[PDB]
């Protein structure tokens, strides 16, 4: 609603231009007349104080044991039906003291404890679902840290980050930004790394959900979480929703699923609507990451739902060296290990294997209370990770 | 009656309890004397292997 | 004496004022007003008596209301923490390094990923290696996976939260209970913690062939959990674990390097290990002099941790059928015959 | 006059009172109690109530108009009454069990023996089992053994049925489960049987219907009360089920009932011992050979064995005879075992 | 088992209220008779007659069956391809008959709570019996007859 | 504050005296449902939510025709007298399906579906608008249309567009909302609709 700050962010002069001065003095004159305008009338008309008298009378009209209940329906204004504490419905009378605006059908209502009526709305406790996927800040991974993938970082920048920092570009050519991005590649290529990189330099509520939690126990509590996921995203202003391992909504079978595949499909048919249905969309951008782009219904990937398909290949030899350097940056090597010699250990190392080598190297140096990794540590590190 | 599902439904474990009561009052800790029961069914295969 | 008579004379007039409701204050509000939920009854927003400072009125706790003009009277004794209820339904026995047998190399390898990264940070940053988050313990059943996991969660002063489904306890962690990433909502509140996740759902003898089944809701748990402790997670004091009898049936995702930082090994005890294991569980009965335990270990080739702690206990039982008060050598020898020799088939 | 004020405060006792429950004492002259109407009240305790009776959850009488402790009732219960011999004893000897020595011995060493020779277990060092589960095929002789234990027992026996613990009045089930354990403690040597525990302990729990939220409390109350035994009160719990696969794992952990006594289908040896013990009380004739009947590959556990004898003699009354001939048993086996066509000899 | 009113303060029987039926079951009794004469249906001549002689005729000529001692047939199932005139005959037969025409449905007897479905079936037949000769039509029987 | 503090100027507009004039003279009622209309003259049978099934007649101002069986009606909190009929209860999840804001797309952003659009307007955009044309002939206009085709062809656009010009109420349904946990209430959402 209204914003307490930012009375007039007219910083267009951005200098000592006199235009800044004229507006400021305007309020000062209005303030002066208001001062004696309120106190003067507050003496010969000592009916309402507006500071202690106003609040006082309403409190008496309220009750000491204020009740809490659920508003069930909105009958004509000044009248509503509110569900009592346990199981009863009362045709209460709405009092004007309430804002009369936050009366959503089912949020909350405060009622007098004897003549039950509407006395006031109650803000709804942050539902546990919102807190579950409300990623605050990406801990450490920056955007120059990712390294390697270069032509693939421009697509994500140009779909989920540019339209929020420089909208003019998709503002003068009359082109709406590409709807979504789907990331696909072998197991371990930076798919999620780039996914959390965008969360770093972003100004929107990031939400993350893995494909495995989209499949639930009871029937119907399937394509109902999908509705909740996109209901939270809309309520939270600009937001990037990240679905990870989307290939778990029909690639993995779980006994907890009361309904079998037939139930999982209806989850997809609800996810299909939530990405492109005849409802309004607003500002919500979907990033889907998967390691098997060939095992999902070719309608979830239809242009319009997800537009830009980004392909993540196994690291190139030149990029392999960059991966080692970034991961080994904060490591006191023993000027005896050569990075180039370990670049060729197996025909194709994902890159997540590179970090595994550089992380097991340290654990192989801790065992000897040594703060310098030698070629022996890496040699045994390169065998304990990608061999067994 | 029924077969006492494993992984049944919410309002199906309750019917299971009723069977476990009709089941226990037939032959339980207090033998029932001079009360004979007659049961009929068109599908005597879904019955629990305790009835 | 005059005062005592006066007090007892006013009790009759005192034990008639209506009692006080007992409620729980979900969240404090403004203007020295609190919002409490009463026992089998609806929520209420109630004023607070001036004797009690609003600062003391904290999130969930037990309070009182007068009788009809509800007003907080006293901050009653605190309610049982919801997590402690989870640790009471599930009963992972408390264990220490002393009742650890034959596993000395494994004990060293467990303290390096759950103890050092917790009790001694700024040592893993001296090498630049990110802290390990998640250890997979494998081996035959009863080898001691849970006995060691609790020990490392007992000597590091970290809460030991076990998640195994059990929808009976699926109300102390989350009322909604929609996605597994709700245990964290309580995990990050209880200081450093270890999220054990056991396995062995009667596997190894059932569901060998196809038909129904599929996946395992003890394996999909980390894939959800480990996907969050590897990035989008602020409090870096939570670490996960599994115990599984097989490492060749793990999904292709849990075996990708970079997810599980360490894969400890739990083999069936050897001769020098069974003797030590037998010794620990044998220091609980009135053993006789000169019980040759080295001879008992030989007689049991293959016993993870339970076929051994099934000879000590059954040895005592065999000393009861005779009506004796001392456990003799014969009792232990006759015990291995039952647990191992007679039970070898099937 | 002090003696007069003491005898005047008793007016607060009165006849019409509401029985509550003691939960926790907050300080001297005050306590927290739970009314049977369903609530938790902050009341004030009378200054003449012997605090020694203000034990953990117990029976306390509260004033009707204004809740306030005014007495401490002796322990009691509602739907759990100890079996007081009379016509309510099982009436089944151990000699009527068809040779289940291995199973019979196990129950003896885990239920009967500890109650009598309690001090021996401490001397040897073993920790007595605190509850035995009785799981097996449907009709292998589970309840019958318990029927025998209740007979040759020197300790009180308390019988319950699993479905009895869930009732219409919300919040009454937890109180009923709690009264059984409380009543089983007053008579220290006692055995608690919860038959058909499948109806109270099942893994699946859908927490929206209200029938499952009331069963989530019964099971939780059982678990809470089975952890309150301090290794000094001998109240053994015997729990008999048919499908162990449905039991919540939390109920089969140390401290709870941890002694799984399997009751499998009788083997050839046992089968011969069952026909003999059942046929002992029958008339029977010389020409009847039991061996010919316990020779087949069929798997008949304990009831079709009784059904065979039951129907075999049943045939005798058809022609008005008081002996059972071999011609009678033959006609009985073919109408009781009814072997299935399972075979398809082309598979072997 | 009868329904009886009781004084609110000093409980005491004052009247015997008429038997109550579930609000759902009362809403399935047709009051506005459909207007569809038998001449509206075409082709189904050998089948319209077979129904009128098993559900309507035995209701107006009881003197005829009792003369020959044959119990009238119970029930008339109507099956066929998706659209052939099944509901037209039922709607038409609800017009050329001066009797209660309790109109059931398919998915409708199905209710979530245990035993709620039985109530709507026992109550849907007690009501018809409580009234004059009645025809109870159960359309879309698959939902409750699988 | 933080509960219901509204524009303070509106509170005095609330006429606190009238509020007191309304927080006493106006008796608060309780919702109920009528089951029977026991004959004699009044004698209505009532069923409050979770208290009991009482017997009530009327107060003074509700016409007998104003009340009918199975109709929501409020009742007194002391003597249980019907005072005002109440609307029927519509499941909130089914009442949220009604579109309140027209989608911002018209019948000029779909191209190539000239024949499809024309055939989709004589069954959803002409029987309602200009409903007298068909009266001067015996025609019951077709009621219902199935739009099928490969994904991303325009099935929803031609539907989102019709809602932009339609005068009658437009009701959404996704086909997955009609899947619910318990047996039964997946047809309630199709009966209430
Ligand atoms: N190209 C890369 N550049 C930098 N780091 C990389 C690269 N590829 C993998 N990594 C590292 O691999 C580690 C573990 O795997 P990672 O999270 O990157 O997997 P992913 O590529 O998103 O795959 P998946 O979708 O299978 O989870 C990350 O912490 C990341 O730093
Ligand atoms: N060894 C046996 N000797 C004598 N009777 C036996 C034997 N085994 C089984 N029976 C017969 O089995 C019948 C049922 O036994 P019991 O009442 O103990 O039930 P159960 O097998 O435990 O049943 P459930 O498992 O369904 O609860 C008894 O009437 C008894 O005569
Ligand atoms: N004929 C058309 N003219 C213009 N745009 C079109 C046309 N057909 C489809 N589109 C485009 O299709 C997008 C939306 O597709 P829509 O959801 O309507 O297709 P669909 O095949 O009916 O969907 P689905 O099968 O996924 O429910 C819009 O961006 C719209 O511009
Ligand atoms: N090395 C050991 N020393 C002593 N006891 C052990 C050992 N290994 C297992 N145990 C016994 O096993 C029990 C727990 O076994 P658990 O870890 O659950 O086996 P598993 O890992 O096969 O599930 C403990 O009570 C403990 O006494
Ligand atoms: N013989 C017929 N004469 C006229 N209309 C018919 C005939 N058969 C079917 N219909 C048409 O079919 C519609 C009724 O369909 P119906 O047969 O009730 O479907 P179902 O068989 O699935 O119940 C009516 O609108 C009617 O006009
Ligand atoms: Mg990934
Ligand atoms: Mg039974
Ligand atoms: Mg569509």
From Swiss-Prot, chain A:
UniProt record similarity statement: Belongs to the AAA ATPase family.
Region Disordered, residue ranges: 43-63
Gene3D superfamilies: 1.10.8.60, Nucleic acid-binding proteins (2.40.50.140), P-loop containing nucleotide triphosphate hydrolases (3.40.50.300)
Name used for this protein in its record: 26S proteasome regulatory subunit 4
Annotated consequence of substituting residue 287 to T: In BKAH; uncertain significance; contrary to the wild type, it fails to rescue eye defects in Rpt2-null Drosophila
Primary location group: cytoplasm
Keywords associated with the record: Acetylation, ATP-binding, Cytoplasm, Deafness, Intellectual disability, Isopeptide bond, Lipoprotein, Membrane, Myristate, Nucleotide-binding, Nucleus, Phosphoprotein, Proteasome, Ubl conjugation
Entry's disease: Birk-Aharoni syndrome: An autosomal recessive disorder characterized by failure to thrive, severe developmental delay, intellectual disability, spastic tetraplegia with central hypotonia, chorea, hearing loss, micropenis and undescended testes, as well as mild elevation of liver enzymes.
Species annotation: Homo sapiens
PANTHER family the UniProt entry points to: 26S PROTEASOME REGULATORY SUBUNIT
InterPro entries per record: 26S_Proteasome_ATPase, AAA+_ATPase, AAA_lid_3, ATPase_AAA_core, ATPase_AAA_CS, NA-bd_OB-fold, P-loop_NTPase, Prot_ATP_ID_OB_2nd
Curated annotation (Swiss-Prot), chain C:
Annotated region described as May mediate interaction with PRPF9, given as residue ranges: 135-346
Keywords annotated in UniProt: Acetylation, ATP-binding, Cytoplasm, Nucleotide-binding, Nucleus, Phosphoprotein, Proteasome
InterPro entries found in the cross-reference section: 26S_Proteasome_ATPase (IPR050221), AAA+_ATPase (IPR003593), AAA_lid_3 (IPR041569), ATPase_AAA_core (IPR003959), ATPase_AAA_CS (IPR003960), NA-bd_OB-fold (IPR012340), P-loop_NTPase (IPR027417), Prot_ATP_ID_OB_2nd (IPR032501)
Molecular functions (GO terms): ATP binding; ATP hydrolysis activity; DNA-binding transcription factor binding; general transcription initiation factor binding; proteasome-activating activity; TBP-class protein binding; thyrotropin-releasing hormone receptor binding; transcription factor binding
Chain positions with Phosphoserine modification: 69
Record has Iron as a keyword: no
Keyword Nucleotide-binding: yes
Main location: cytoplasm
Binding site residues for ATP: 139-146
UniProt family annotation: Belongs to the AAA ATPase family.
Protein name: 26S proteasome regulatory subunit 8
Taxon lineage: Eukaryota, Metazoa, Chordata, Craniata, Vertebrata
Gene behind the chain: PSMC5
UniProtKB/Swiss-Prot annotation, chain D:
Name listed for the protein in its UniProt record: 26S proteasome regulatory subunit 6B
Cellular localization per UniProt: Cytoplasm; Nucleus
MF terms in GO: ATP binding; ATP hydrolysis activity; proteasome-activating activity
Protein family per UniProt: Belongs to the AAA ATPase family.
Subunit structure: Component of the 19S proteasome regulatory particle complex. The 26S proteasome consists of a 20S core particle (CP) and two 19S regulatory subunits (RP). The regulatory particle is made of a lid composed of 9 subunits, a base containing 6 ATPases including PSMC4 and few additional components. Interacts with NR1I3. Interacts with PAAF1. Interacts with TRIM5. Interacts with ZFAND1.
UniProt keyword annotation of Acetylation present: yes
Gene: PSMC4
Function in brief: Component of the 26S proteasome, a multiprotein complex involved in the ATP-dependent degradation of ubiquitinated proteins. This complex plays a key role in the maintenance of protein homeostasis by removing misfolded or damaged proteins, which could impair cellular functions, and by removing proteins whose functions are no longer required. Therefore, the proteasome participates in numerous cellular processes, including cell cycle progression, apoptosis, or DNA damage repair.
Segments forming a coiled coil: none
Positions spanned in the full protein: 71 to 418 of 418
GO biological process: blastocyst development; proteasome-mediated ubiquitin-dependent protein catabolic process; proteolysis
Binding site for ATP: 136-143
Organism of origin: Homo sapiens (Human)
Record keyword Nucleus present: yes
Main location per the UniProt record: cytoplasm
Modified residue annotations for N6-acetyllysine: 327, 331
Swiss-Prot record, chain E:
Subunit note: Component of the 19S proteasome regulatory particle complex. The 26S proteasome consists of a 20S core particle (CP) and two 19S regulatory subunits (RP). The regulatory particle is made of a lid composed of 9 subunits, a base containing 6 ATPases including PSMC3 and few additional components. Interacts with PAAF1. (Microbial infection) Interacts with HIV-1 Tat.
Protein name (Swiss-Prot/TrEMBL): 26S proteasome regulatory subunit 6A
Family recorded in the similarity comment: Belongs to the AAA ATPase family.
Residues of the full protein shown: 148 to 293 of 439
Function per UniProt: Component of the 26S proteasome, a multiprotein complex involved in the ATP-dependent degradation of ubiquitinated proteins. This complex plays a key role in the maintenance of protein homeostasis by removing misfolded or damaged proteins, which could impair cellular functions, and by removing proteins whose functions are no longer required. Therefore, the proteasome participates in numerous cellular processes, including cell cycle progression, apoptosis, or DNA damage repair.
Residues spanning the signal sequence: none
Post-translational modification: Sumoylated by UBE2I in response to MEKK1-mediated stimuli.
Positions that bind ATP: 80-87
Cystine connections: none
Gene source species: Homo sapiens (Human)
Subcellular location: Cytoplasm; Nucleus
């Amino acid at each position: 609603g209204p914003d307490a700050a930012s009375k007039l962010p007219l910083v267009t002069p951005h200098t000592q231009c006199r235009l800044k001065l004229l507006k400021l003095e305007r309020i000062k004159d209005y303030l002066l007349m208001e001062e004696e305008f309120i106190r003067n009338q507050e003496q010969m008309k000592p009916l309402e104080e507006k500071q202690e008298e106003e609040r006082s009378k309403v409190d008496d009209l309220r009750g000491t044991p204020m009740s809490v209940g659920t508003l069930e329906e909105i009958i004509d204004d000044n009248h509503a039906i509110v569900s009592t504490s346990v199981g009863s419905e009362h045709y209460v009378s709405i009092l004007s003291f309430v804002d009369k605006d936050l009366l959503e059908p089912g949020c909350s209502v405060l009622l007098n404890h004897k003549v039950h009526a509407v006395i006031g709305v109650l803000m709804d406790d942050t539902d546990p679902l919102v807190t579950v996927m409300k990623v605050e800040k990406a801990p450490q991974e920056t955007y120059a840290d990712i390294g390697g993938l270069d032509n693939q970082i421009q697509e994500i920048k140009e779909s989920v980050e540019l339209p929020l920092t420089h909208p003019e570009y998709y503002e003068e050519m009359g082109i709406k930004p590409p709807k979504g991005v789907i990331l696909y590649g072998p197991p371990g290529t930076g798919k999620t790394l780039l996914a959390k990189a965008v969360a770093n330099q972003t100004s929107a509520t990031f939400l993350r959900v893995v494909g495995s939690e989209l499949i639930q126990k009871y029937l119907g509590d399937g394509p109902k979480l999908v509705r909740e996921l996109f209901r939270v995203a809309e309520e939270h202003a600009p937001s990037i929703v990240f679905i990870d391992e989307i290939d778990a909504i029909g690639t993995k079978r779980y006994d907890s699923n009361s309904g079998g595949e037939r139930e999982i499909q209806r989850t997809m048919l609800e996810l299909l609507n939530q990405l492109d249905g005849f409802d309004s969309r607003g500002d919500v951008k979907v990033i889907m990451a998967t390691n098997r782009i060939e095992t999902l219904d070719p309608a979830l990937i239809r242009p319009g739902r997800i537009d830009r398909k980004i392909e993540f290949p196994l690291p190139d030899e030149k990029t392999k060296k960059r991966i080692f350097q970034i991961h080994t940056s904060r490591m006191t090597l023993a000027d005896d290990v050569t990075l180039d010699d370990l670049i060729m250990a197996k025909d194709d190392l994902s890159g997540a294997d590179i970090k595994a080598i550089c992380t097991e190297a340290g654990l192989m140096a801790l065992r000897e209370r040594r703060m310098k990794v030698t070629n022996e540590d890496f040699k045994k590190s390169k065998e304990n990770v990608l061999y067994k | 009656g029924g077969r006492r599902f494993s992984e049944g439904t919410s309002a199906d474990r309750e019917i299971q309890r009723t069977l476990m009561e009709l089941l226990n009052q037939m032959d339980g800790f207090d033998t029932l004397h001079r009360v004979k029961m007659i049961m009929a069914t068109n599908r005597p295969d879904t019955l629990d292997p305790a009835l | 004496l005059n005062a005592k008579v006066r007090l007892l004379r006013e009790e009759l007039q005192l034990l008639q004022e209506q009692g006080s409701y007992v409620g729980e204050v979900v969240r404090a509000m403004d203007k020295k007003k609190v919002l409490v939920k009463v026992h089998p009854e609806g929520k209420f927003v109630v004023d607070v008596d001036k004797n009690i400072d609003i600062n003391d009125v904290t999130p969930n706790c037990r309070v009182a209301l007068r009788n009809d003009s509800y007003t907080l009277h006293k901050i009653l004794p605190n309610k049982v923490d919801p997590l402690v209820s989870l640790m009471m339904v599930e009963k992972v026995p408390d264990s220490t390094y002393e009742m650890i047998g034959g596993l000395d190399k494994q004990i060293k390898e467990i303290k390096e990923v759950i103890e050092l990264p917790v009790k001694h940070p700024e040592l893993f940053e001296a090498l630049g290696i990110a802290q390990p988050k998640g250890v997979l313990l494998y081996g035959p059943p009863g080898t001691g996976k849970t006995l060691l996991a609790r020990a490392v969660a007992h000597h590091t002063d970290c809460t030991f939260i076990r998640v195994s489904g059990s929808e009976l306890v699926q109300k102390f962690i989350g009322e909604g209970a929609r996605m597994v990433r709700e245990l964290f909502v309580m995990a990050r509140e209880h200081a450093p913690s270890i999220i054990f996740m056991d396995e062995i759902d009667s596997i190894g003898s059932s569901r060998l062939e196809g038909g129904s089944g599929g996946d395992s809701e003890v394996q999909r748990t980390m894939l959800e959990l480990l996907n969050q402790l590897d990035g989008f997670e602020a409090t870096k004091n939570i670490k996960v674990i599994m115990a599984t009898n097989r490492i060749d049936i793990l999904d292709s995702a849990l075996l990708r390097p970079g997810r599980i930082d360490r894969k400890i090994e739990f083999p069936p005890p050897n001769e020098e290990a069974r003797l030590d294991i037998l010794k620990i569980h044998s220091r609980k009965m009135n053993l006789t002099r000169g019980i040759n335990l080295r001879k008992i270990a030989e007689l049991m080739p293959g016993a993870s941790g339970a076929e051994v702690k099934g000879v000590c206990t059954e040895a005592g039982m065999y000393a009861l059928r005779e009506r004796r008060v001392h456990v003799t050598q014969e009792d232990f020898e006759m015990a291995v015959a039952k647990v191992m020799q007679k039970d070898s088939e099937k | 006059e002090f003696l007069h004020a003491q005898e005047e405060v008793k007016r607060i006792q009165s006849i019409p009172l509401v029985i509550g429950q003691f939960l926790e004492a907050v300080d001297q002259n005050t306590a927290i109690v739970g009314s049977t109407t369903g609530s938790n009240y902050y009341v004030r305790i009378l200054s003449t109530i012997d605090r020694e009776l203000l034990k953990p959850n117990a029976s306390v009488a509260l004033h009707k108009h204004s809740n306030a402790l005014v007495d401490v009732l002796p322990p009691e219960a509602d739907s759990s009454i100890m079996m007081l011999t009379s016509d309510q004893k099982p009436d089944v000897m151990y000699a009527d069990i068809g040779g289940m020595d291995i199973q019979k011995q196990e129950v003896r060493e885990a239920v009967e023996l500890p109650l009598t020779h309690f001090e021996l277990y401490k001397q040897i060092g073993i920790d007595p089992p605190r509850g035995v589960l009785m799981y097996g095929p449907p009709g292998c002789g589970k309840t019958m053994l318990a029927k025998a234990v209740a007979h040759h027992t020197t300790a009180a026996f308390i019988r319950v049925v699993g479905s009895e613990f869930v009732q219409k009045y919300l919040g009454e089930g937890p109180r009923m489960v709690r009264d059984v354990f409380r009543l089983a403690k007053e008579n220290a040597p006692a055995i608690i049987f919860i038959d058909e525990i499948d109806a109270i302990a099942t893994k699946r729990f859908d927490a929206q219907t209200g029938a499952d939220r009331e069963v989530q409390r019964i099971l939780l109350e059982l678990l809470n009360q089975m952890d309150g035994f301090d290794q000094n009160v001998n109240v053994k719990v015997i729990m008999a089920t048919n499908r162990a696969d449905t039991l919540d794992p939390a109920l089969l952990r140390p401290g709870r009932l941890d002694r799984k006594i399997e009751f499998p289908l009788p083997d050839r040896r046992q089968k011969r011992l069952i026909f003999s013990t059942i046929t002992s009380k029958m008339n029977l004739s010389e020409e009847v050979d039991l061996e010919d009947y316990v020779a087949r590959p069929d798997k008949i556990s304990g009831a079709d064995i009784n059904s065979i004898c039951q129907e075999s003699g049943m045939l005798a009354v058809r022609e008005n005879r008081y002996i059972v001939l071999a011609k009678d048993f033959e006609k009985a086996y073919k109408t009781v075992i009814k072997k299935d066509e399972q075979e398809h000899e082309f598979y072997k | 088992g009868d329904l009886v009113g009781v004084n609110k303060d000093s409980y005491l029987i004052l009247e015997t209220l008429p038997t109550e039926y579930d609000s759902r079951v009362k809403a399935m009794e047709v009051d506005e008779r459909p207007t569809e004469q038998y001449s509206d249906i075409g082709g189904l001549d050998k089948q319209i007659q077979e129904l009128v002689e098993a559900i309507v005729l035995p209701m107006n000529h009881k003197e005829k069956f009792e003369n020959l001692g044959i119990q009238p047939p119970k029930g008339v199932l109507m099956y066929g391809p998706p659209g052939t005139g099944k509901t037209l005959l039922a709607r038409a037969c609800a017009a050329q008959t001066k009797a209660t025409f309790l109109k059931l449905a398919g998915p409708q007897l199905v209710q979530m709570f245990i035993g709620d479905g039985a109530k709507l079936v026992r109550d849907a037949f007690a009501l018809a019996k409580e009234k004059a000769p009645s025809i109870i039509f159960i359309d879309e029987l698959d939902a409750i007859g699988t | 504050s933080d509960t219901g503090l509204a524009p303070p100027a509106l509170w005095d507009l609330a006429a606190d005296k009238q509020t007191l004039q309304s927080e006493q003279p106006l008796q608060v009622a309780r919702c109920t449902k009528i089951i029977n209309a026991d004959s004699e003259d009044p004698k209505y049978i009532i069923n409050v939510k979770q208290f009991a099934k009482f017997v009530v007649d009327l107060s003074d101002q509700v016409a007998p025709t104003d009340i009918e069986e199975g109709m929501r009606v409020g009742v007194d909190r002391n003597k249980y007298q019907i005072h005002i009929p109440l609307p029927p209860k519509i499941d909130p999840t089914v009442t949220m399906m009604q579109v309140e804001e027209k989608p911002d797309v018209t019948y000029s952003d779909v191209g190539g579906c000239k024949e499809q659009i024309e055939k989709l307007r004589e069954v959803v955009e002409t029987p309602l608008l200009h409903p007298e044309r068909f009266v001067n002939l015996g025609i019951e206009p077709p009621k219902g249309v199935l739009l099928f085709g490969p994904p991303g062809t325009g099935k929803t656009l031609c539907a989102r567009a019709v809602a932009n010009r339609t005068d009658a109420c437009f009701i959404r349904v996704i086909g997955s909302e009609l899947v619910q946990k318990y047996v039964g209430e997946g047809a309630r959402m199709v009966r209430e609709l």
